[PDB]
Design an enzyme around this catalytic site. Structure first.
Site, short mmCIF file in Angstrom:
data_model
loop_
_atom_site.label_atom_id
_atom_site.label_comp_id
_atom_site.label_asym_id
_atom_site.label_seq_id
_atom_site.Cartn_x
_atom_site.Cartn_y
_atom_site.Cartn_z
CG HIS A 1 3.53 5.79 -9.63
ND1 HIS A 1 4.52 4.77 -10.19
CD2 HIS A 1 3.05 5.48 -8.10
CE1 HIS A 1 4.17 4.08 -8.57
NE2 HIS A 1 3.74 4.39 -8.15
CG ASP B 1 6.93 -19.75 -33.33
OD1 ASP B 1 7.41 -18.55 -34.88
OD2 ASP B 1 6.17 -19.72 -33.58
CD1 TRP C 1 -4.84 0.27 -9.53
CD2 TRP C 1 -4.82 -1.00 -7.72
NE1 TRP C 1 -4.59 -1.14 -9.74
CE2 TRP C 1 -4.64 -1.46 -8.28
CE3 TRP C 1 -4.37 -0.79 -6.03
CZ2 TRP C 1 -4.41 -3.05 -8.07
CZ3 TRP C 1 -4.49 -1.68 -5.74
CH2 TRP C 1 -3.92 -3.61 -6.47
CB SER D 1 -2.33 -6.89 -23.89
OG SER D 1 -1.82 -7.47 -23.20
CB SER D 2 -2.15 -10.28 -19.66
OG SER D 2 -2.27 -10.64 -18.42
CG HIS E 1 -5.44 -11.42 -3.32
ND1 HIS E 1 -4.29 -11.17 -2.44
CD2 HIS E 1 -5.28 -12.63 -3.21
CE1 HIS E 1 -2.96 -12.38 -1.53
NE2 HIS E 1 -3.98 -13.96 -1.93
CD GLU F 1 -2.97 -8.29 -11.90
OE1 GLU F 1 -3.10 -8.86 -12.77
OE2 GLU F 1 -1.45 -7.84 -12.79
CE1 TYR G 1 0.02 -14.18 -2.55
CE2 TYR G 1 -2.41 -13.81 -2.77
CZ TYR G 1 -0.86 -13.62 -1.82
OH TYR G 1 -1.12 -13.94 -0.69
CB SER H 1 12.80 -21.68 -8.33
OG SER H 1 11.96 -21.07 -9.48
CG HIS I 1 -7.01 -10.34 2.49
ND1 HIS I 1 -7.13 -11.57 1.31
CD2 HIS I 1 -5.55 -9.28 1.96
CE1 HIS I 1 -6.18 -11.58 0.40
NE2 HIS I 1 -5.66 -9.90 0.65
CG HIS I 2 -7.59 -6.61 -0.56
ND1 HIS I 2 -6.14 -6.65 -0.88
CD2 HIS I 2 -7.74 -7.87 -0.91
CE1 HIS I 2 -5.55 -7.34 -1.09
NE2 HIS I 2 -6.70 -7.97 -1.27
CB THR J 1 4.96 -18.28 0.86
OG1 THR J 1 3.43 -18.12 0.04
CG2 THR J 1 5.43 -17.28 -0.21
CE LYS K 1 7.32 -20.59 -4.72
NZ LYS K 1 8.03 -21.39 -5.66
NE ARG L 1 -2.96 3.16 0.35
CZ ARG L 1 -2.83 2.36 -0.37
NH1 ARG L 1 -4.05 1.57 0.23
NH2 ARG L 1 -3.76 2.11 -1.53
C1 HEA Z 1 4.95 -2.42 -9.46
C2 HEA Z 1 3.90 -1.63 -8.12
C3 HEA Z 1 4.87 -0.48 -7.74
C4 HEA Z 1 5.92 -0.46 -7.42
C5 HEA Z 1 6.92 -1.28 -8.55
C6 HEA Z 1 6.24 0.60 -6.81
C7 HEA Z 1 7.07 2.03 -6.63
C8 HEA Z 1 6.92 2.46 -6.07
N1 HEA Z 1 6.05 3.03 -5.28
FE1 HEA Z 1 3.93 2.92 -6.05
N2 HEA Z 1 2.51 2.33 -5.78
C9 HEA Z 1 2.02 1.13 -6.02
C10 HEA Z 1 2.61 0.35 -6.90
C11 HEA Z 1 4.13 0.51 -7.42
N3 HEA Z 1 5.13 0.96 -6.98
C12 HEA Z 1 -0.09 0.61 -6.46
C13 HEA Z 1 -0.03 -0.06 -6.05
C14 HEA Z 1 0.01 2.64 -5.29
C15 HEA Z 1 -1.54 2.94 -4.81
C16 HEA Z 1 -1.99 3.74 -5.18
C17 HEA Z 1 -3.19 3.52 -4.58
O1 HEA Z 1 -4.07 2.63 -4.44
O2 HEA Z 1 -3.89 4.66 -4.14
C18 HEA Z 1 1.68 3.19 -4.83
C19 HEA Z 1 1.53 4.28 -4.19
C20 HEA Z 1 2.57 4.19 -4.14
C21 HEA Z 1 2.76 5.98 -3.52
C22 HEA Z 1 1.74 7.11 -2.28
C23 HEA Z 1 0.99 6.00 -1.47
C24 HEA Z 1 -1.08 5.92 -1.21
O3 HEA Z 1 -1.08 6.65 -1.10
O4 HEA Z 1 -1.34 4.73 -1.11
C25 HEA Z 1 3.42 6.33 -2.84
C26 HEA Z 1 4.39 7.34 -2.10
O5 HEA Z 1 5.30 7.51 -1.76
C27 HEA Z 1 4.53 5.46 -4.06
C28 HEA Z 1 6.18 5.72 -4.28
C29 HEA Z 1 6.42 4.38 -4.57
C30 HEA Z 1 7.76 4.59 -5.06
C31 HEA Z 1 9.10 5.55 -4.34
C32 HEA Z 1 8.55 3.55 -6.18
C33 HEA Z 1 9.86 3.00 -6.31
O6 HEA Z 1 9.95 1.36 -5.75
C34 HEA Z 1 10.33 3.53 -7.74
C35 HEA Z 1 11.98 3.77 -7.63
C36 HEA Z 1 12.39 2.25 -8.01
C37 HEA Z 1 13.51 2.00 -9.13
C38 HEA Z 1 14.31 2.52 -9.59
C39 HEA Z 1 12.68 0.70 -9.67
C40 HEA Z 1 11.37 0.25 -10.63
C41 HEA Z 1 11.96 0.92 -12.40
C42 HEA Z 1 11.83 0.22 -12.78
C43 HEA Z 1 12.41 1.07 -14.97
C44 HEA Z 1 11.41 -0.75 -12.76
C45 HEA Z 1 12.79 -1.58 -13.36
C46 HEA Z 1 12.77 -2.48 -14.61
C47 HEA Z 1 13.52 -2.79 -15.15
C48 HEA Z 1 13.79 -1.84 -15.95
C49 HEA Z 1 13.89 -4.60 -16.01
N4 HEA Z 1 3.63 4.61 -4.79
C1 HEA Z 2 2.14 -7.63 -5.08
C2 HEA Z 2 2.60 -8.97 -4.42
C3 HEA Z 2 1.72 -9.44 -2.88
C4 HEA Z 2 1.80 -10.10 -2.48
C5 HEA Z 2 2.78 -11.00 -2.60
C6 HEA Z 2 1.10 -10.45 -1.20
C7 HEA Z 2 0.99 -10.99 -0.15
C8 HEA Z 2 0.32 -10.90 1.05
N1 HEA Z 2 -0.76 -10.29 0.91
FE1 HEA Z 2 -0.80 -8.15 0.39
N2 HEA Z 2 -1.21 -6.29 -0.71
C9 HEA Z 2 -0.72 -6.35 -1.85
C10 HEA Z 2 0.74 -6.87 -2.42
C11 HEA Z 2 1.23 -8.30 -2.35
N3 HEA Z 2 0.54 -9.31 -1.36
C12 HEA Z 2 -1.20 -5.02 -2.20
C13 HEA Z 2 -0.88 -4.46 -4.04
C14 HEA Z 2 -2.37 -4.84 -1.56
C15 HEA Z 2 -2.98 -3.77 -1.81
C16 HEA Z 2 -2.89 -1.98 -1.40
C17 HEA Z 2 -4.15 -1.28 -1.84
O1 HEA Z 2 -5.18 -1.86 -2.16
O2 HEA Z 2 -4.29 -0.40 -2.95
C18 HEA Z 2 -1.93 -5.37 -1.14
C19 HEA Z 2 -3.36 -6.25 0.17
C20 HEA Z 2 -3.34 -6.99 1.51
C21 HEA Z 2 -4.19 -6.63 2.33
C22 HEA Z 2 -4.63 -5.71 2.57
C23 HEA Z 2 -4.96 -4.65 3.52
C24 HEA Z 2 -6.04 -2.90 3.51
O3 HEA Z 2 -5.51 -3.02 2.01
O4 HEA Z 2 -6.49 -3.13 4.42
C25 HEA Z 2 -3.76 -8.01 3.35
C26 HEA Z 2 -4.16 -7.70 4.45
O5 HEA Z 2 -5.13 -9.13 4.54
C27 HEA Z 2 -2.82 -8.02 2.84
C28 HEA Z 2 -1.95 -9.57 3.40
C29 HEA Z 2 -0.94 -10.34 2.08
C30 HEA Z 2 -0.89 -11.65 3.07
C31 HEA Z 2 -1.11 -12.28 3.40
C32 HEA Z 2 0.05 -11.95 2.06
C33 HEA Z 2 0.96 -13.92 1.52
O6 HEA Z 2 0.95 -14.49 0.79
C34 HEA Z 2 2.44 -13.48 2.50
C35 HEA Z 2 2.92 -14.48 3.45
C36 HEA Z 2 3.96 -14.63 3.26
C37 HEA Z 2 5.04 -15.11 3.90
C38 HEA Z 2 4.50 -15.32 6.19
C39 HEA Z 2 6.24 -14.72 4.25
C40 HEA Z 2 7.41 -16.11 3.99
C41 HEA Z 2 6.91 -17.44 4.68
C42 HEA Z 2 7.64 -18.12 6.58
C43 HEA Z 2 9.01 -17.67 6.12
C44 HEA Z 2 6.91 -18.98 6.07
C45 HEA Z 2 5.88 -19.36 6.96
C46 HEA Z 2 5.66 -17.45 8.42
C47 HEA Z 2 4.79 -17.82 9.73
C48 HEA Z 2 4.56 -18.57 10.31
C49 HEA Z 2 4.90 -16.05 10.04
N4 HEA Z 2 -2.06 -7.48 1.92
CU LIG Z 3 -4.71 -9.00 -1.11
#
Ligand code: HEA
Ligand code: HEA
Ligand SMILES: [Cu+2]
Ligand SMILES: CCCCCCCCCCC(=O)OC[C@H](COP(=O)(O)OC[C@H](O)COP(=O)(O)OC[C@@H](COC(=O)CC)OC(=O)CCC)OC(=O)CCCCCCCC
Ligand SMILES: CCCCCCCCCCCCCCCC(=O)OC[C@H](COP(=O)([O-])OCC[N+](C)(C)C)OC(=O)CCCCCCCCCCCCCCC
Ligand SMILES: CCCCCCCCCCCCCCCC(=O)OC[C@H](COP(=O)([O-])OCC[N+](C)(C)C)OC(=O)CCCCCCCCCCCCCCC
Ligand SMILES: CCCCCCCCCCCCCCCCCCCC(=O)O[C@H](COC(=O)CCCCCCCCCCCCCC)COP(=O)(O)OCCN
Ligand SMILES: CCCCCCCCCCCCCCCCCCCC(=O)O[C@H](COC(=O)CCCCCCCCCCCCCC)COP(=O)(O)OCCN
Ligand SMILES: CCCCCCCCCCCCCCCCCCCC(=O)O[C@H](COC(=O)CCCCCCCCCCCCCC)COP(=O)(O)OCCN
Ligand SMILES: CCCCCCCCCCCCCCCCCCCC(=O)O[C@H](COC(=O)CCCCCCCCCCCCCC)COP(=O)(O)OCCN
Ligand SMILES: CCCCCCCCCCCCCCCCCCCC(=O)O[C@H](COC(=O)CCCCCCCCCCCCCC)COP(=O)(O)OCCN
Ligand code: CUA
Lengths: 53, 38, 99, 530, 268, 55, 51, 236, 78
Positions: free
Chosen positions: D58, D88, D123, D153-154, D237, D239, D241, D252, D286-287, D312, D315, D434
């Site tokens: 998933h 194109d 994953w 592809s990407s 990270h 990916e 972003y 925007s 940081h992960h 951010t 933005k 998890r």
């Molecule tokens: C793109 C990223 C993405 C999205 C959208 C989701 C969406 C959801 N995810 Fe998932 N999820 C992950 C990425 C994502 N997840 C990742 C990386 C992990 C961790 C795996 C690992 O590290 O072990 C994870 C893990 C994860 C867990 C396990 C937690 C753990 O073990 O770490 C669970 C269980 O609750 C969960 C649930 C859901 C649910 C309920 C949604 C719901 O939001 C989905 C239902 C909502 C929808 C209806 C909207 C989406 C449907 C579409 C079709 C999109 C629409 C777009 C077009 C059609 C235009 N996700």
């Molecule tokens: C897809 C989008 C996405 C985005 C945008 C971000 C954005 C950020 N993520 Fe996250 N992150 C994930 C997706 C994302 N992350 C995923 C998939 C994982 C890992 C899960 C996995 O391993 O399965 C992860 C994991 C992850 C970890 C690892 C935790 C762990 O596994 O132990 C940490 C910790 O540092 C982190 C931090 C952040 C931070 C600091 C930002 C920052 O960029 C965000 C900052 C934004 C703001 C703060 C808000 C707007 C700003 C303000 C209003 C003004 C400024 C704010 C203040 C002064 C407070 N992310």
């Molecule tokens: Cu990160």
């Protein structure tokens, strides 16, 4: 006749600082009515462990 | 004379309504725990 | 930039209006600024509507003036000031028409 | 047609697959959340395998087969030809392999589950869990190849966008005046280029340590599994972003169209948008705060990944400045783009709480992370994908989408997925780990709250299929009755109704000045700007 | 006039007919990746489907390339910008293939910059004997410094207009590279440590391993740069199929010198 | 030598560009023979690879 | 699609003029995509003892 | 300690290393509610008060006097909040004067402690595994997947120093009531030093995935007194 | 009162990764028993160190790699 200016400027300064004043009445309760309430219990129980002598 | 009573009346039922959003958008787990402790 | 440079610039552009389009596209950005327009420039916003023979773009002046006046006390003194040039052209307001 | 090299008809094949991989990527998350409904294995009988298979099944369909091919393929192959002024893409023949390897990236993944073992690796495919002594069959062999077909592809799907923007513009389109959706993907294309060859070595080395026993990662031989934790996450990270910068391009455009106003600080929005992309490179461990790094190395990252919250904030506060003065026309792309501005930013505050090395040591691998990264994936990259489909659906298909029925699909997504992902912060602050099929009995509280919501969001997605049915069958009978909204910009206060039909679309982009649908040659003359 | 101008294209950028080799290469990448993961686990018995998958892929590249040279010299939408499109589309591409070395250089700085415990406290460890840089590896650096002085000796010579230096100057560069394959075949046949020789055996046949897997396509790139220049395909004012070969080798001096300083000089 | 000669044949050919070479009829039917086998035999062994039947 | 920029002719579907109703061929593309994990939960349970 | 059904806060702090986290999780979230209090207010004054504004103020774009304000505003809270975040990093490696060394090694389905410090008079290490009890052997009253069979005893008011590693698949070592979390890398080993300050049992979990039996690995640990611990060490 | 005793800070290995502390104390003990043997009390500070902070299977490993002469570290100082 009156050269009225600043209807948006009077609705940004009034608009920003009443959110900072609204960002405090949710946060100063969270750090006093919850955080200091939680440190009240841990300061109490650890003072009921140093009583045993 | 204008922005002392007209800027108020736009904002008095606003914060009376804005806190009602966050008590449902964020405070909704304070009801499912209240309803069924079992 | 200032209140007076606002007045002299848009009371000038109403003269070379020549069309219904270049009244409404210039009445728009004479109302879409931060400030409130003077009655000197809005007198040429009714004379511009008389030069193009269109009445509801002169009734929509006083309705855009009603929402963007920020005070009813600053509107009735502003309405009675324009009553000298609003009774010549016979422009009603939207509440008196009751449409 | 199948192998037509027109960039318009490739991006409609991209979008035809990102819902098929979507309704497979969320049917797996249905069964995942159905198993976390109660303690004890309910629907899966006693099998803790096929749960680390469904989770990786998933989480890679959502990342690499939904949000990657839609926000880069499904839109970037349709809008970057169109908004800039190209006919194109610059490389239109490799534009077709960038789609047609994605179903071959699906046969390399659905058959990775049907074989006898099942890739129960998660994953983040870690080396000793996925080593050949642990995972024996050809299950994880295909799961590290379907991740390679999408990696390739990407990658050429972003070489297609650096030599499109840099030379194939119009006359007056200088380098400081572009649409922000193009500056989203052109900045993204300088991250897709400089992070995917890092990944392609970090997977092939795991292939070499599995059937060629070279011991890049094998412990018997000195090969660390901790080299993987900084080499995969050097891709990881950037990916995440990349799933948000085209998400920062659509928002925007929507929030400054349905507000009749240009965007606040456009030159400020393009410098704080590569600074996210550039500084996102320098924060990649940081992960892995707890994996045993140095006391000054973690002291650098706890100060360096907080600086991602500097651009951010620019933005976001500018999106709270570009709608302050102007009007607000609350149609469906404006509803998504205004709930994106509340649920993504709450996924940012949980970001800077996790960002500290002094606080990730009580939060790693818990459910507080899954509460954080789903507020910025299903609420920051689905809230900008639904706000990009509804913003360009009748302009591109030609048919309107029953606007009264797309408002109930917004609210069932808003409150029907906030009910899932908000109590995840409570299960993780206690310490539920998890990827587990079962849990201690005290974690049955919110895991039934978050289980009632996955039927709400996936009932809205069943409704979204019917909107796609109402848009294709009698989607022409929508703009002739009062079902939908036709003009996305209502005229001004002093703009008369009879003069509006002369000057109808007051857009700031070419995308609406085209016909609906656009022509097969919508640019047969070099257009001019200013 | 305007009647001929209404019979031609009005924008310099190229429009391509729908070719089916897009889905042919895609079907080969399926049968590459699916079949290379089956024979590692059985289900076939013989290791020749991968040899089939290296044959249907590479003939699909030249049929892709046969349509491109049909557009390069026989249909010709190659204007100034489209010439700058590929010349920047390939110069930005090799930024990706120079960063994949940083996915292999950084493993060498992961097992030698900090000494480990499973091996010895020295790099290269005991039992493993490395080749000094004052040996046949020093022939590998000078033969590319001579390659870097003959790829530009024949770069301007094709533009110079005479075919005595342009044709013959690329045959002497082509056999300068096939002879580079055979001296990187000595250490693949005479060196002590193997691919399975721990972490020193891993990254040494990876950093120099991928540097050997590019000469099979570079010599194949000279295999058409001599055939086209003999069949009069390439020109002296518009050459893309010749320009991408020089930048395939002018950056190769930089990456091999960074490969020689840490694998051999700092690697002993 | 053949660059002007092929340019008469390639330009105004009214053919698909991968059929526009004069030496292209023999290039396809053996190529369509190795294409008709390399996309079924990696996939026909998949029901053989579901029951544990390996080699 | 190379030409005929009509209304339904930029999509590889056949929406109008189909012999069979379109809800067969539209839900039958999106429910089939919904039923692929429910056959991964079938041939991996029946192989591994469960049912 | 023990998780609570329908809870929302930390488990009870039994370590000053754990007690520092609770005063940093609340030091951060005090500066997160001003930002959430601003955004939830600045999005309700726009959707409500400005959706009824038909004249769009379309001539305010740059704003130079507010452009520079909100780029030092994330640079004024983050400079403040990092100083309690630096004081916790440099004061959680305090392995200067320890008092005890215990081991914890996880072989993919259990743990394997050994008390290799030879203060015990027998002069031998005490190694013992930690298997979770299955549902068939479940004694009525035991916590499911949270209570093992062979627990682990540690004294109180003592400067212990763990060593955590593995000989197989990576899976970490997490007790949330003590704030200890290290990876158990197979090739190397990690240490933590957590002074426990109260008697009582702590239950934890293993966080990082290992394979099929990831749910079947708890980390049970109880704290007893130092004479009461020595009566266990002279036995086994 | 305070009967417990273990290895102190060991400032040359102050990080979280104490694997070279386990490795070198196995080295510094077995380099002491062959070279400059006059007593055991400054020689058992490296014996009492590597019994702590080391697993039992590793000491079984390091005494098996030493026995076939396949110890990857320098075991023979003499
Ligand atoms: C793109 C990223 C993405 C999205 C959208 C989701 C969406 C959801 N995810 Fe998932 N999820 C992950 C990425 C994502 N997840 C990742 C990386 C992990 C961790 C795996 C690992 O590290 O072990 C994870 C893990 C994860 C867990 C396990 C937690 C753990 O073990 O770490 C669970 C269980 O609750 C969960 C649930 C859901 C649910 C309920 C949604 C719901 O939001 C989905 C239902 C909502 C929808 C209806 C909207 C989406 C449907 C579409 C079709 C999109 C629409 C777009 C077009 C059609 C235009 N996700
Ligand atoms: C897809 C989008 C996405 C985005 C945008 C971000 C954005 C950020 N993520 Fe996250 N992150 C994930 C997706 C994302 N992350 C995923 C998939 C994982 C890992 C899960 C996995 O391993 O399965 C992860 C994991 C992850 C970890 C690892 C935790 C762990 O596994 O132990 C940490 C910790 O540092 C982190 C931090 C952040 C931070 C600091 C930002 C920052 O960029 C965000 C900052 C934004 C703001 C703060 C808000 C707007 C700003 C303000 C209003 C003004 C400024 C704010 C203040 C002064 C407070 N992310
Ligand atoms: Cu990160
Ligand atoms: C895998 C793919 C599976 C897909 C399955 C998804 C199913 C979703 C179906 C949603 C749907 O089709 O609804 C659209 C349909 C047409 O609406 P319209 O946009 O043309 O405008 C109508 C007009 O403007 C106002 O309609 P009006 O107000 O006059 O009718 C009242 C209507 C409102 O109540 C409800 O919506 C909920 C019951 O109540 C009823 O009709 C009750 C009749 C029994 O509106 C309806 O009439 C809905 C009737 C109920 C259908 C069953 C509901 C199940 C939840
Ligand atoms: C906000 C948008 C809608 C939110 C919907 C939330 C749904 C909550 C829910 O489903 O909670 C169910 C609980 C369970 O109660 P329990 O204590 O677990 O009892 C056992 C019941 N089992 C699990 C055996 C079936 O039972 C309850 O607590 C039922 C109470 C119903 C609360 C309604 C919503 C709360 C107010 C939101 C405003
Ligand atoms: C997608 C499809 C797959 C794409 C990647 C394929 C590349 C890997 C192919 C490896 C094939 C193989 O079996 O290679 C073995 C060689 C020979 O190694 P060797 O002959 O044992 O060398 C020792 C010398 N003796 C002691 C004999 C004298 O050992 C080597 O030197 C290996 C050379 C290749 C190094 C590849 C590095 C990978 C980096 C990432 C690339 C991603 C693109
Ligand atoms: C969103 C804004 C916060 C409030 C939303 C509704 C939930 C909060 C009230 C209900 C509640 O029990 O939360 C209290 C604290 O919440 C808070 O303090 C949240 C801070 C705002 C704790 O309530 P309690 O005093 O029962 O604590 C029980 C200790 N066992
Ligand atoms: C890695 C793949 C190559 C990366 C660089 C591709 C971009 C520069 C080369 C180039 O422009 O030719 C492409 C064809 O190459 C290709 O499509 C061949 C790459 C796919 C087969 C790889 C075989 C490796 C052995 C574009 O093709 P185009 O027809 O769109 O350009 C129409 C020109 N006016
Ligand atoms: C390794 C993976 C490589 C991936 C793709 C790399 C492509 C780089 C070159 C891009 C082609 C540029 C181009 O279009 O040049 C045209 C042909 O080049 C070509 O056809 C170059 C062919 C390269 C073949 C080497 C790749 C595999 C070889 C076979 C297996 C061994 C000639 O255009 P022009 O300038 O001559 O037009 C003059 C007419 N008057
Ligand atoms: C930024 C946003 C990121 C998300 C932050 C996640 C939460 C952060 C921690 C704050 C939690 C405050 C809860 C205080 C509390 O103890 O209330 C619980 C009950 O509240 C409830 O059951 C209803 C919970 C309402 C909490 C809403 C929190 C909003 C965020 C700010 C507040 C106590 O219950 P218990 O655990 O003592 O019950 C034992 C049964 N035997
Ligand atoms: C922080 C969180 C912000 C969240 C989003 C808020 C969006 C607000 C956008 C407001 C419009 C931006 C803007 O430029 O307004 C200017 C003044 O506002 C301002 O200056 C804003 C107030 C800045 C803070 C207060 C500065 C001290 C003022 C002392 C008053 C007591 C008007 O510019 P203009 O129309 O004057 O320009 C004419 C030159 N002739
Ligand atoms: Cu061991 Cu998870």
């Amino acid at each position: 006749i009156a050269p009225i200016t600043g209807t948006i400027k009077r609705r940004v300064i009034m608009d920003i600082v009443l959110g900072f004043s609204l960002g405090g009445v949710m946060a100063s309760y969270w750090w006093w009515g919850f955080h200091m309430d939680k440190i009240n219990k841990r300061e109490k129980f650890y003072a009921e462990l140093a009583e045993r002598k | 004379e204008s922005w002392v009573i007209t800027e108020g009346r736009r904002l008095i039922p606003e914060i009376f309504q804005w806190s009602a959003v966050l008590s449902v958008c964020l405070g909704w787990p304070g009801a499912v725990y209240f309803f069924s402790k079992a | 930039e200032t209140f007076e440079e606002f007045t002299a610039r848009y009371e000038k552009e109403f003269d070379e209006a020549y069309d219904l389009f270049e009244v409404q596209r210039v009445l728009n950005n004479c109302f879409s600024y931060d400030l409130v327009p003077a009655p000197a420039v809005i007198e040429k916003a009714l004379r511009a509507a008389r030069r193009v023979n269109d009445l509801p773009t002169a009734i929509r002046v006083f309705e855009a003036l009603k929402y963007k006046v920020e005070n009813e006390d600053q509107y009735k003194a502003y309405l009675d000031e324009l009553k000298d040039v609003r009774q010549e052209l016979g422009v009603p307001l939207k509440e008196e028409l009751f449409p | 047609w199948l192998y037509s090299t027109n960039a318009k008809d490739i991006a409609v094949l991209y979008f035809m697959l990102a819902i098929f991989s979507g309704m497979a990527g969320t049917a797996m998350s249905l069964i995942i959340r159905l198993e976390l409904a109660a303690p004890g294995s309910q629907y899966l009988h006693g099998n803790s395998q096929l749960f680390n298979v469904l989770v990786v099944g998933h989480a890679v369909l959502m990342i690499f087969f939904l949000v990657m091919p839609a926000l880069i393929g499904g839109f970037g192959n349709y809008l970057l030809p169109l908004m800039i002024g190209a006919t194109d893409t610059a490389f239109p023949r490799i534009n077709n392999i960038a789609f047609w390897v994605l179903p071959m990236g699906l046969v390399c993944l659905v058959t990775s589950t049907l074989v006898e073992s099942g890739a129960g690796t998660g994953w983040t495919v870690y080396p000793p869990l996925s080593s050949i002594q642990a995972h024996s069959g050809p299950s994880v062999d295909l799961a590290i190849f379907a991740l390679h077909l999408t990696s390739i592809s990407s990658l050429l799907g972003a070489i297609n966008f650096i030599v499109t923007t840099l030379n194939m513009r119009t006359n007056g389109m200088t380098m400081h005046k572009l649409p922000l959706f193009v500056w989203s993907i052109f900045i993204t294309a300088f991250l897709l280029l400089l992070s995917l060859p890092v990944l392609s070595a970090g997977i092939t080395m795991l292939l070499l340590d599995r059937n060629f026993n070279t011991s890049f990662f094998e412990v018997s031989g000195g090969g660390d599994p901790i080299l993987y934790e900084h080499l995969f996450w050097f891709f990881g990270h950037p990916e995440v972003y990349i799933l948000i910068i085209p998400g920062f391009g659509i928002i925007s455009h929507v929030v400054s169209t349905y507000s009749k106003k240009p965007v606040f600080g456009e030159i400020s929005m393009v410098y704080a948008m590569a600074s996210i992309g550039l500084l996102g490179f320098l924060v990649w461990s940081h992960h892995m705060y707890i994996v045993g790094l140095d006391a000054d190395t973690r002291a650098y990252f706890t100060s360096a990944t907080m600086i991602i919250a500097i651009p951010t904030g620019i933005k976001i506060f500018s999106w709270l400045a570009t709608i302050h003065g102007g009007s607000i026309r609350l149609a469906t792309p404006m509803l998504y783009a205004i709930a994106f501005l509340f649920l993504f930013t709450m996924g940012g505050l949980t970001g800077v709480a996790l960002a500290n090395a002094s606080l990730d040591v009580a939060f790693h691998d818990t459910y507080y992370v899954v509460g954080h990264f789903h507020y910025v994936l299903s609420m920051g990259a689905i809230f900008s994908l639904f706000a990009g489909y509804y913003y360009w659906s009748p302009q591109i298909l030609g048919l309107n989408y029953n606007e009264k029925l797309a408002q109930i699909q917004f609210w069932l997504i808003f409150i029907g997925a906030n009910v899932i992902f908000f109590p995840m912060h409570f299960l993780g602050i206690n310490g539920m780990p998890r990827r587990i099929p079962d849990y201690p009995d005290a974690f049955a509280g919110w895991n039934y709250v978050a289980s009632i919501g996955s039927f709400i969001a996936t009932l809205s997605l069943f409704l979204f299929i019917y909107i796609l049915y109402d848009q294709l069958v009698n989607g022409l009978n929508n703009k002739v009755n009062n079902k939908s909204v036709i003009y996305n910009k209502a005229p001004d206060f002093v703009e008369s109704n009879t003069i509006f039909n002369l000057n109808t679309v007051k857009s700031s982009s070419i995308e609406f000045l085209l016909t609906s649908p656009p022509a097969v040659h919508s640019f047969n003359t070099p257009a001019v700007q200013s | 006039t305007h009647l001929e101008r209404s019979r031609h294209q009005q924008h310099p950028f190229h429009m391509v007919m729908p070719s089916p080799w897009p889905i042919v290469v895609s079907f080969a990448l399926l049968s590459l990746a699916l079949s290379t993961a089956l024979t590692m686990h059985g289900y076939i018995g013989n290791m020749n489907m991968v040899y089939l998958a290296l044959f249907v892929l590479l003939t699909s590249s030249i049929l892709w390339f046969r349509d491109i040279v049909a557009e390069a010299t026989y249909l010709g939408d190659h204007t100034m910008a489209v010439r700058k499109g590929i010349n920047l589309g390939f110069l930005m591409f090799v930024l990706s293939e120079v960063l994949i070395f940083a996915g292999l250089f950084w493993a060498y700085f992961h097992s030698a910059m900090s000494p480990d415990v499973t091996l010895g406290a020295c790099w290269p460890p005991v039992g493993i004997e490395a080749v000094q840089p004052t040996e046949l590896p020093l022939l590998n650096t000078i033969i590319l410094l001579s390659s870097g002085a003959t790829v530009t000796y024949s770069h301007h010579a094709l533009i110079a207009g005479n075919r005595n230096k342009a044709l013959s100057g690329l045959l002497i560069t082509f056999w300068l590279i096939v002879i580079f394959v055979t001296c990187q075949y000595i250490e693949y046949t005479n060196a002590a440590f193997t691919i399975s020789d721990g972490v020193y055996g891993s990254v040494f046949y990876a950093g120099t391993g991928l540097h050997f897997l590019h000469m099979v396509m570079l010599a194949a790139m000279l295999g058409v740069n001599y055939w086209r220049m003999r069949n009069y395909h390439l020109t002296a004012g518009h050459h893309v199929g010749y320009e991408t070969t020089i930048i395939y080798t002018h950056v190769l001096d930089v990456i091999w010198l960074f490969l020689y300083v840490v694998f051999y000089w700092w690697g002993v | 030598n053949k660059v002007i000669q092929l340019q008469k044949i390639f330009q105004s050919s009214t053919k698909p560009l991968w059929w526009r070479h004069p030496r292209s009829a023999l290039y396809l039917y053996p190529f369509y023979a190795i294409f008709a086998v390399a996309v079924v035999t990696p996939l026909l062994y998949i029901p053989n690879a579901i029951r544990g039947i390996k080699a | 699609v190379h030409f005929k920029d009509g209304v339904y002719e930029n999509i590889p579907f056949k929406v109008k003029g189909r012999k069979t109703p379109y809800a067969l061929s539209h839900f039958g593309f999106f429910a089939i995509g919904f039923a692929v994990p429910f056959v991964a939960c079938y041939v991996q349970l029946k192989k591994s003892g469960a049912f | 300690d023990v998780p609570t059904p329908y809870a929302c806060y930390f488990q009870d702090s039994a370590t000053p290393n754990q007690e520092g986290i609770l005063e940093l999780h609340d030091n951060i979230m005090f500066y997160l509610l001003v930002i959430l209090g601003l955004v939830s207010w600045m999005l309700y004054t726009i959707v409500m008060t400005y959706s009824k504004n038909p004249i769009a103020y379309k001539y305010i774009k740059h704003g130079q006097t507010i452009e520079v304000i909100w780029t030092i505003f994330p640079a004024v809270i983050l400079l403040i909040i990092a100083f309690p975040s630096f004081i916790l990093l440099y004061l959680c490696d305090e392995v200067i004067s320890p008092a005890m060394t215990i081991k914890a090694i996880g072989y993919q389905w259990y743990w394997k402690y050994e008390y290799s410090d030879f203060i015990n008079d027998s002069g031998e290490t005490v190694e013992f595994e930690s298997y979770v009890i299955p549902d068939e052997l479940l004694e009525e009253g035991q916590l499911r997947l949270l209570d093992t069979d062979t627990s682990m005893v540690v004294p109180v008011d003592t400067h212990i120093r763990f060593v955590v590693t593995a000989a197989d698949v990576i899976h970490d070592f997490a007790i949330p009531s003590l704030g200890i979390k290290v990876d158990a890398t197979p090739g190397r080993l990690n240490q933590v030093s957590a002074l426990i300050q109260r008697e009582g049992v702590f239950y934890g979990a293993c966080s990082e995935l290992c394979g099929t039996g990831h749910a079947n690995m708890p980390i049970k640990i109880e704290a007893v007194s130092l004479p009461k611990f020595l009566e266990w060490l002279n036995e086994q | 009162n305070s009967p417990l005793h273990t290895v102190g800070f060991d400032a040359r290995f102050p990080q979280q990764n104490q694997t070279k502390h386990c490795w070198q104390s196995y080295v510094d003990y077995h380099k002491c028993v062959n070279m400059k043997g006059e007593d055991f009390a400054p020689c058992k500070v490296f014996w009492k160190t590597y019994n702590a902070l080391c697993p039992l299977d590793w000491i079984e490993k390091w005494d098996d790699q030493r026995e076939k002469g396949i110890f990857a570290g320098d075991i023979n100082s003499d």
